[PDB]
């Protein structure tokens, strides 16, 4: 009955350092719909995070798109932290700019 | 136009 969220962290545009962009956290294939998603910059919570509204797919599982404005640098790390009932602890997925 | 379920 519990389905564990699949997470991808990636940018809207091909990333270039110093250039404004959007960082996305796409969370899919989870159940039940209740979920907490936070986007992080060097381990620290980002304030203005826009969350898509509750939506489900033809297979009945839920999905959410979280995004935020960001300017990548060489050394700033970005991550998505997802809390859900299917998991004992929150899961942190790191942004890997090559994908 | 939304559905209304059969009572």
């Amino acid at each position: 009955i519990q389905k564990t969220p699949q997470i991808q962290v990636y940018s809207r545009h091909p990333p270039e350092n110093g250039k404004p962009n959007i960082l996305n956290c796409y969370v899919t294939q989870f159940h039940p719909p209740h979920i907490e998603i936070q986007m992080l910059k060097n381990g620290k919570k980002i304030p203005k995070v826009e969350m898509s509204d509750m939506s489900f797919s033809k297979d009945w599982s839920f999905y959410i798109l979280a995004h935020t404005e960001f300017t990548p640098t060489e050394t700033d790390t970005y991550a998505c932290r997802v809390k859900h009932d299917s998991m004992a602890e929150p899961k942190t997925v790191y942004w890997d700019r090559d994908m | 136009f939304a559905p209304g379920n059969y009572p």
Partner: protein, 274 residues
């Protein structure tokens, strides 16, 4: 091209809350266009496409009144399901519904849909004939028996063959520009060295989401040893995907990536380009 309309409804109860939250979302050609949510103050169906705001005030009130009825219908169904499955109170439960109309490129009905899920699993569905019901679970037989003896089916058949179709025609004419337009995929290959090199084939700026990427070596699509990601939204209404293969450096350019998408006049073929 062919068109569709759907309404996804959900009611969720949680071990804290007294009353379930009910949410309903409408889509046309797989794009959201209306939404209602009982957690908002003054709950109401509100538009989600620039082309829907065009609709009048009495359209909006009507819909809202339907949603209010649905909310109650879901609330009583949730309470009964707890008994049908012998679930003690103090958990989270979910009930979902999909319903809608599919149309061909001629704008005639191809198929109606009406399906329900409990706890994210199939509970009962109206078959394609729009007369009979499928229900797998032992607990769900209670519902199947009630509905078989009541012309629930004829009710939903009238909606799916009638209103669903007529309003979808209305909506299609009004928001003709957003929905008909497809965005073809713009693709390219990126290069990433290794022990061996990683070729990653990208597809970007495409709509709708369905797409297929393959890699070929001397005319053979490489089954295992190809990585990919699930198709994902860019957040601007287009989507992305990529597919990577690992190949020896110097055996680059013997590999071709193919992108198949409904917006293309034909499949794209690509190789690594310095």
């Amino acid at each position: 091209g062919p068109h569709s309309m759907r309404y996804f409804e959900t009611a969720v109860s949680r071990p804290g809350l007294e009353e379930p939250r009910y949410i309903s979302v409408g889509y046309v050609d797989n794009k959201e266009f209306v939404r209602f949510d009982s957690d908002a103050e003054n709950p109401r169906y509100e538009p989600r496409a620039p082309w829907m705001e065009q609709e009048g005030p009495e359209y909006w009130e009507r819909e809202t009144q339907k949603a209010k009825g649905q909310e109650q219908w879901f609330r009583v169904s949730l309470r009964n399901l707890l008994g049908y499955y012998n679930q003690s109170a103090g958990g989270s439960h979910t009930l979902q519904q999909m319903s809608g109309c599919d149309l061909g490129s001629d704008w005639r009905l191809l198929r109606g849909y009406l399906q329900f899920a409990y706890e994210g699993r199939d509970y009962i569905a109206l078959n394609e004939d729009l007369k009979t019901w499928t229900a797998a679970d032992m607990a769900a037989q209670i519902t199947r028996r009630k509905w078989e003896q009541s012309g629930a089916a004829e009710h939903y058949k009238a909606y799916l063959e009638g209103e669903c179709v007529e309003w979808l025609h209305r909506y299609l004419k009004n928001g003709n520009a957003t929905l008909l337009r497809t965005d073809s995929p713009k693709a390219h290959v990126t290069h990433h060295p290794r022990s061996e090199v990683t070729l990653r084939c990208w597809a970007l700026g495409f709509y709708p989401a369905d797409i297929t990427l393959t890699w070929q070596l001397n005319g053979e699509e490489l089954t295992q040893d190809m990585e990919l990601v699930e198709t994902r939204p860019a957040g601007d209404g287009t989507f992305q995907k990529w597919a990577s293969v690992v190949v020896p450096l110097g055996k680059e350019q013997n590999y071709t990536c193919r992108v198949y998408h409904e917006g293309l006049p034909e499949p794209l073929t690509l190789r690594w380009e310095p």
